[PDB]
Amino acid sequence: GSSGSSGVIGTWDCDTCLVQNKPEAIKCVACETPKPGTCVKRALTLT
Ligand SMILES: [Zn+2]
């Protein structure tokens, strides 16, 4: 919400290789790095 919002888009931009990966892939394809954020935001109630 405020103080920095999380990309509300689908695909996520990697940090190591900085490659474009689908929101379905749990990990990257180039560097094969595990997506950050252990907890799933979904947990909370949608708008
Ligand atoms: Zn990567």
Side-chain angles (χ1 to χ4, degrees), residues 19-44:
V19 74
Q20 194 152 84
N21 314 286
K22 292 152 162 173
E24 301 185 327
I26 70 288
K27 64 156 189 292
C28 203
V29 60
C31 65
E32 299 181 316
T33 191
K35 204 173 172 278
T38 181
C39 71
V40 297
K41 66 201 280 291
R42 283 192 182 274
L44 65 87

Side-chain angles (χ1 to χ4, degrees), residues 5-24:
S5 57
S6 80
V8 295
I9 27 56
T11 51
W12 48 287
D13 87 309
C14 206
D15 166 275
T16 299
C17 71
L18 304 165
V19 74
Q20 194 152 84
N21 314 286
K22 292 152 162 173
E24 301 185 327

